[PDB]
Amino acid sequence: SVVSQVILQADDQLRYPTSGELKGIQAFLTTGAQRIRIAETLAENEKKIVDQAQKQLFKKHPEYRAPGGNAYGQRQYNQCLRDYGWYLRLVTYGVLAGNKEPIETTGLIGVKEMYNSLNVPVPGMVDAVTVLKDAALGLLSAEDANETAPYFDYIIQFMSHH
Amino acid sequence: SVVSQVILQADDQLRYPTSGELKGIQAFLTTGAQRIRIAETLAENEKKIVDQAQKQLFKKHPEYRAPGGNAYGQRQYNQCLRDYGWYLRLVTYGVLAGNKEPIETTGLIGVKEMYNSLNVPVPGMVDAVTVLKDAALGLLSAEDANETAPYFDYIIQFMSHH
Amino acid sequence: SVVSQVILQADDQLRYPTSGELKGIQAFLTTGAQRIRIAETLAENEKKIVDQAQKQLFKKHPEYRAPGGNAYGQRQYNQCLRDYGWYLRLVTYGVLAGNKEPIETTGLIGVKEMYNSLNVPVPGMVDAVTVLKDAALGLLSAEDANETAPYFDYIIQFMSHH
Amino acid sequence: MQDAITAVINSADVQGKYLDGAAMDKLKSYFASGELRVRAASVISANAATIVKEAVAKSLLYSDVTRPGGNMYTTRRYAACIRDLDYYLRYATYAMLAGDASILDERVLNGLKETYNSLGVPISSTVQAIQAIKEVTASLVGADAGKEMGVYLDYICSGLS
Amino acid sequence: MQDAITAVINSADVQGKYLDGAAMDKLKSYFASGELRVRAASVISANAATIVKEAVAKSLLYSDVTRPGGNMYTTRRYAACIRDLDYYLRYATYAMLAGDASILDERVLNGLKETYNSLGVPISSTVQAIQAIKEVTASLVGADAGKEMGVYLDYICSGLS
Amino acid sequence: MQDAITAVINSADVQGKYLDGAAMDKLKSYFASGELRVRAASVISANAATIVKEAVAKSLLYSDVTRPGGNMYTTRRYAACIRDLDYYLRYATYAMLAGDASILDERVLNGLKETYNSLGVPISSTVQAIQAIKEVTASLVGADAGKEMGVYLDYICSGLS
Numbered sequence: 001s002v003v004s005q006v007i008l009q010a011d012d013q014l015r016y017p018t019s020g021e022l023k024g025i026q027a028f029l030t031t032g033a034q035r036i037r038i039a040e041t042l043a044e045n046e047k048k049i050v051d052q053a054q055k056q057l058f059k060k061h062p063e064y065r066a067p068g069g070n071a072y073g074q075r076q077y078n079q080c081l082r083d084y085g086w087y088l089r090l091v092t093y094g095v096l097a098g099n100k101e102p103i104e105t106t107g108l109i110g111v112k113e114m115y116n117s118l119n120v121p122v123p124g125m126v127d128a129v130t131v132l133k134d135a136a137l138g139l140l141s142a143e144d145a146n147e148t149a150p151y152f153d154y155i156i157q158f159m160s161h162h
Numbered sequence: 163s164v165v166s167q168v169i170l171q172a173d174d175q176l177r178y179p180t181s182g183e184l185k186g187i188q189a190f191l192t193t194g195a196q197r198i199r200i201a202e203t204l205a206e207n208e209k210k211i212v213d214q215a216q217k218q219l220f221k222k223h224p225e226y227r228a229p230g231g232n233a234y235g236q237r238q239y240n241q242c243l244r245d246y247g248w249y250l251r252l253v254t255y256g257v258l259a260g261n262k263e264p265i266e267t268t269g270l271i272g273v274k275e276m277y278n279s280l281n282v283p284v285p286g287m288v289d290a291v292t293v294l295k296d297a298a299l300g301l302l303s304a305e306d307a308n309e310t311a312p313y314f315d316y317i318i319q320f321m322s323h324h
Numbered sequence: 325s326v327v328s329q330v331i332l333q334a335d336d337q338l339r340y341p342t343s344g345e346l347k348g349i350q351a352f353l354t355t356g357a358q359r360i361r362i363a364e365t366l367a368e369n370e371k372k373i374v375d376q377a378q379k380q381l382f383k384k385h386p387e388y389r390a391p392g393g394n395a396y397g398q399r400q401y402n403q404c405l406r407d408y409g410w411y412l413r414l415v416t417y418g419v420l421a422g423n424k425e426p427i428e429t430t431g432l433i434g435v436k437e438m439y440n441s442l443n444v445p446v447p448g449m450v451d452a453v454t455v456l457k458d459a460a461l462g463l464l465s466a467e468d469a470n471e472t473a474p475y476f477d478y479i480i481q482f483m484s485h486h
Numbered sequence: 487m488q489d490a491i492t493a494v495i496n497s498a499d500v501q502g503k504y505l506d507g508a509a510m511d512k513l514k515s516y517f518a519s520g521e522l523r524v525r526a527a528s529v530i531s532a533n534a535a536t537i538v539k540e541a542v543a544k545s546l547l548y549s550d551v552t553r554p555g556g557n558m559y560t561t562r563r564y565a566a567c568i569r570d571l572d573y574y575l576r577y578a579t580y581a582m583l584a585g586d587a588s589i590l591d592e593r594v595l596n597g598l599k600e601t602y603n604s605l606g607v608p609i610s611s612t613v614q615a616i617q618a619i620k621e622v623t624a625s626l627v628g629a630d631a632g633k634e635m636g637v638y639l640d641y642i643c644s645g646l647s
Numbered sequence: 648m649q650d651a652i653t654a655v656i657n658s659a660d661v662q663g664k665y666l667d668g669a670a671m672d673k674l675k676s677y678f679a680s681g682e683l684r685v686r687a688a689s690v691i692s693a694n695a696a697t698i699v700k701e702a703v704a705k706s707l708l709y710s711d712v713t714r715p716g717g718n719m720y721t722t723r724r725y726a727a728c729i730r731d732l733d734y735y736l737r738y739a740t741y742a743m744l745a746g747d748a749s750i751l752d753e754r755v756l757n758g759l760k761e762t763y764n765s766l767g768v769p770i771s772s773t774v775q776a777i778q779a780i781k782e783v784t785a786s787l788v789g790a791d792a793g794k795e796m797g798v799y800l801d802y803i804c805s806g807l808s
Numbered sequence: 809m810q811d812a813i814t815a816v817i818n819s820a821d822v823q824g825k826y827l828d829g830a831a832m833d834k835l836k837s838y839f840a841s842g843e844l845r846v847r848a849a850s851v852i853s854a855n856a857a858t859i860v861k862e863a864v865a866k867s868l869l870y871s872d873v874t875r876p877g878g879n880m881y882t883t884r885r886y887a888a889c890i891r892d893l894d895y896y897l898r899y900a901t902y903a904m905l906a907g908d909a910s911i912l913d914e915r916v917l918n919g920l921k922e923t924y925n926s927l928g929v930p931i932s933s934t935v936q937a938i939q940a941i942k943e944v945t946a947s948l949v950g951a952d953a954g955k956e957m958g959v960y961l962d963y964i965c966s967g968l969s
């Protein structure tokens with residue numbers, strides 16, 4: 001999390017954390033209750049969030065469920081819905097950690113190599129997470145949606161580049 | 163051989179061999195029968211080839227078999243003839259491999275350090291292999307002599323330079 | 325000593341010692357008797373030398389034995405006298421070796437980190453060895469004092485310069 | 487490394503001998519196999535990504551290995567696994583082209599088992615995926631080239647076990 | 648390395664689960680401990696040299712360890728020992744801040760025992776000095792922060808034994 | 809490394825002692841041996857290549873070692889062997905000059921036996937060549953210097969066995 005990031009920088013420079021770095025840690029740790037509320041709200045509403053998201057996704061990309069499409073047939077479509085729930089879960093990890101690290105190490109490093117190997121269109125994944133974001137943020141307060149949006153945005157940006 | 167050389171280059175570049183490199187391998191492998199004919203002709207005629215060569219060598223350099231000469235006396239002279247047969251054998255390896263590698267690894271790397279330590283004149287070895295080449299190529303067809311000459315030349319140039 | 329110094333340089337250059345380096349070793353090894361006489365004289369007079377030295381030191385720095393001073397109280401003062409005897413002993417090692425190496429490896433590398441950790445003033449140590457030098461050289465012949473002075477000077481300079 | 491020619495040369499050299507009839511017969515066999523080996527190498531190079539993704543689909547996908555607790559879970563490990571399979575295919579193709587497994591000993595298997603056991607990479611599942619690579623490769627390069635590739639893919643598997 | 652939050656996340660991730668109530672309770676405890684940890688880190692940073700100096704005076708000075716034949720004799724070894732103690736204090740403070748000992752396994756203890764035994768660095772005396780560091784630290788950061796630092800300083804000691 | 813003087817100093821230092829009479833007697837012995845050691849070092853340096861080639865001629869040439877299957881066969885291995893002997897002579901001369909074998913432990917023998925065993929370098933034949941170096945060297949530097957060199961060449965041999 002935010003804490004380990006500070007510690008790694010300090011260790012790199014053979015030093016204790018600075019007063020500034022410690023103030024940053026202090027500020028992060030007082031925001032815990034909000035992060036937990038967000039994580040539990042998304043977890044509780046997973047099925048509803050994924051359903052709204054997949055409906056919008058396949059309205060935009062019906063060809064994914066047509067013959068020759070990567071999500072053609074029930075087993076493959078259900079595996080897409082499985083992946084959707086996994087990325088929602090990773091977003092809750094990011095919110096709890098206060099940074100992108102748990103999202104990146106589990107779901108982004110190598111993500112293009114993986115989905116290319118599966119013949120799942122990476123631009124389809126960008127579109128998928130975009131409407132996942134819409135569905136999830138819709139169930140949060142304005143304040144909490146603003147806190148949460150950057151974690152979705154990080155996934156979307158990562159999948160758009162390189 | 164030619165094949166290993168291509169593979170080492172490909173591995174260095176983390177890639178498969180190119181179409182060009184594969185064509186080169188194909189071309190090499192169709193020339194096998196010629197190389198085997200050359201190797202067997204030189205092997206069969208070793209005694210004759212070495213005898214012609216040593217006769218010319220010691221006509222040019224009688225001092226090598228005079229007192230104080232490195233090949234003075236029967237045991238030492240016979241060891242020179244032994245070395246002669248060994249370099250002829252290495253040339254057959256080179257012809258079969260289609261490159262200088264088996265000659266270099268067995269008979270050229272460290273060759274000057276060795277013969278210096280033995281007080282055998284390296285310019286003497288240059289002259290020796292030169293007339294070995296003459297004797298060997300004389301027993302081959304024009305075509306086969308042309309194929310074989312660069313393997314002798316490689317030894318001669320190596321013992322001359324650096 | 326002087327000998328190992330030459331050997332390390334030669335080894336670094338993958339070579340035998342030069343005629344010049346060997347001449348230097350020869351010259352060093354013929355001066356052994358003098359070095360032994362100096363070492364035994366300083367050893368024999370340790371108590372006298374340390375007593376003269378500490379008397380001068382604490383005349384200059386009475387605050388070191390006043391309350392709050394690093395050498396306040398008998399146990400601490402006696403440990404200073406102990407250190408004094410140790411540096412005199414290291415000087416005899418330097419004289420025997422013909423260089424500063426035995427002094428540096430035992431008593432100078434890390435010396436500032438050590439005395440800082442002990443709250444012993446390093447400028448106090450500079451002043452201490454300065455009057456140790458005075459006391460020790462006073463018991464040697466002029467020739468032997470000139471031979472020995474550089475080993476004290478090395479300690480003093482080391483403790484002065486960061 | 488050695489190819490098949492250098493291997494025969496070395497066996498003669500360490501005895502101080504010219505190559506005898508048996509040795510020349512080994513060279514003749516290798517020289518004659520040139521077309522087979524070169525064609526297979528071209529086919530595999532052109533189809534390397536497809537061979538690996540099809541092997542993975544047959545042997546690893548939808549199994550415990552790709553679920554949490556399995557060693558291919560996380561995109562980082564998934565991608566690392568694919569990379570290993572790319573390696574195995576490329577080096578097996580080198581060995582097939584050379585007609586000699588020495589490059590596998592020197593550049594693939596060296597310390598590999600220890601590395602996997604320290605990381606928790608499953609040997610059994612890796613061997614299953616390489617075996618799948620063998621069968622997919624055989625379907626493309628034919629029966630005869632498929633046998634040669636099979637020797638060197640099997641060699642890697644034996645080296646891991 | 649992981650901090651306390653990443654550790655709980657990883658335990659959930661390897662099961663493919665959202666954090667349950669028990670997991671959230673662990674996070675709540677860590678979040679609530681923030682003031683304690685940050686204050687202690689600030690105090691230790693400001694007093695790091697004093698803490699080590701005082702621990703050494705309590706546990707090593709005037710003993711066999713600092714006389715000829717002891718492993719702190721020579722200014723070079725004396726300074727190296729101090730440097731080790733500086734390390735142990737700094738890394739224990741990292742681990743206390745993180746609420747997790749993983750950084751100690753990864754960056755302190757890895758191969759350390761073998762290094763000390765090859766060099767002849769005494770384990771017993773080292774552990775005594777680290778224990779002294781624990782008690783000096785506790786006298787400055789208070790009882791509650793002292794307990795947390797004690798966990799990680801004790802962890803280092805156990806890892807050496 | 810240490811030379812003979814530093815060795816005696818270290819034995820005193822680790823006891824916190826000035827050098828006593830017995831220690832000074834050791835130094836006197838080394839100081840008096842200066843002319844012997846320096847002259848021998850000059851002679852060996854001037855004749856290093858000749859000493860090695862004569863030792864090889866006595867102990868290794870015309871034997872199984874230089875024929876196919878032997879470890880000196882191939883010009884590359886022949887030259888590598890000569891280089892080893894160059895090393896042994898040079899480092900033995902260092903140790904003779906220093907009157908101390910420590911440079912041999914630190915810079916020659918360290919991991920050497922394992923290296924040779926991994927490569928298949930024959931220990932028996934190596935030791936025979938070093939012993940030949942000892943006798944050739946003694947013929948040039950005389951009886952007394954020859955004895956000193958013999959100590960350090962024998963030391964290398966014992967370290968290989």
Ligand SMILES: *[C@H](C)[C@H]1/C(=C/c2[nH]c(/C=C3N=C(/C=C4\NC(=O)C(CC)=C4C)C(C)=C\3CCC(=O)O)c(CCC(=O)O)c2C)NC(=O)[C@@H]1C
Nearest residue numbers: 064070071076079080118124125128547548552559560561
């Ligand atoms: C749904 C929004 C999109 C979609 C997805 C889809 N995915 C698969 C198959 C797989 N997905 C994974 C995913 C992961 N493994 C991981 O370690 C992680 C990180 C947490 C992820 C996200 C894997 C391993 C598979 C392969 C099968 C398996 O689980 O072993 C499919 C199946 C079909 C295919 O592979 O092509 C699909 C359809 N498809 C869409 O159209 C969406 C944009």
Ligand SMILES: *[C@H](C)[C@H]1/C(=C/c2[nH]c(/C=C3N=C(/C=C4\NC(=O)C(CC)=C4C)C(C)=C\3CCC(=O)O)c(CCC(=O)O)c2C)NC(=O)[C@@H]1C
Nearest residue numbers: 226232233238241242280286287290869870874881882883
């Ligand atoms: C003959 C054309 C010339 C000549 C040669 C000569 N050589 C020797 C002795 C040795 N030659 C070797 C050679 C090799 N060892 C290898 O591994 C290889 C590589 C394949 C070679 C070529 C060796 C090892 C010896 C030493 C004895 C031994 O076999 O153990 C002699 C003997 C006398 C001497 O050493 O000086 C001679 C005379 N001399 C000539 O004049 C020719 C030009």
Ligand SMILES: *[C@H](C)[C@H]1/C(=C/c2[nH]c(/C=C3N=C(/C=C4\NC(=O)C(CC)=C4C)C(C)=C\3CCC(=O)O)c(CCC(=O)O)c2C)NC(=O)[C@@H]1C
Nearest residue numbers: 388394395400403404442448449452708709713720721722
């Ligand atoms: C006397 C001239 C000065 C002085 C010295 C003083 N030293 C100490 C305590 C220690 N001194 C050492 C010294 C060494 N350890 C080594 O390995 C070497 C190298 C050969 C040395 C010189 C050590 C280890 C100690 C600590 C106690 C121990 O022996 O374990 C004191 C004691 C008080 C203190 O620590 O502050 C003092 C007073 N003080 C002076 O004023 C002089 C300038």
Ligand SMILES: *[C@H](C)[C@H]1/C(=C/c2[nH]c(/C=C3N=C(/C=C4\NC(=O)C(CC)=C4C)C(C)=C\3CCC(=O)O)c(CCC(=O)O)c2C)NC(=O)[C@@H]1C
Nearest residue numbers: 557558563566567568570573593594605607608611612615
């Ligand atoms: C895929 C079939 C399975 C799988 C593999 C997997 N491997 C690693 C990590 C490594 N794999 C290699 C392999 C090689 N490196 C080489 O240079 C070569 C040779 C030419 C090989 C064969 C290595 C060195 C590693 C470690 C270093 C690295 O990652 O580059 C992993 C990742 C382990 C981790 O958590 O870091 C995995 C997942 N895992 C499976 O479950 C498969 C059955």
Ligand SMILES: *[C@H](C)[C@H]1/C(=C/c2[nH]c(/C=C3N=C(/C=C4\NC(=O)C(CC)=C4C)C(C)=C\3CCC(=O)O)c(CCC(=O)O)c2C)NC(=O)[C@@H]1C
Nearest residue numbers: 718719724727728729731734754755766768769772773776
């Ligand atoms: C002090 C309490 C005791 C003592 C210690 C002492 N240690 C060494 C040498 C080393 N100590 C370390 C330790 C670390 N290096 C690291 O990077 C880390 C991790 C963050 C640690 C814990 C190491 C690597 C060394 C060896 C390399 C080096 O010196 O940097 C010494 C010196 C031994 C020598 O003679 O060289 C000593 C003296 N000795 C004591 O007696 C104490 C009880």
Ligand SMILES: *[C@H](C)[C@H]1/C(=C/c2[nH]c(/C=C3N=C(/C=C4\NC(=O)C(CC)=C4C)C(C)=C\3CCC(=O)O)c(CCC(=O)O)c2C)NC(=O)[C@@H]1C
Nearest residue numbers: 879880885888889890892895915916927929930933934937
């Ligand atoms: C000659 C008497 C015998 C012989 C020797 C031989 N040695 C090697 C290879 C190596 N020898 C060394 C030795 C040293 N390297 C050093 O830096 C030092 C220390 C100062 C020593 C003593 C080493 C490291 C090697 C391996 C690395 C290298 O080659 O540089 C070989 C070559 C083995 C090979 O096939 O590569 C040989 C032939 N062999 C004999 O038969 C002799 C009796």
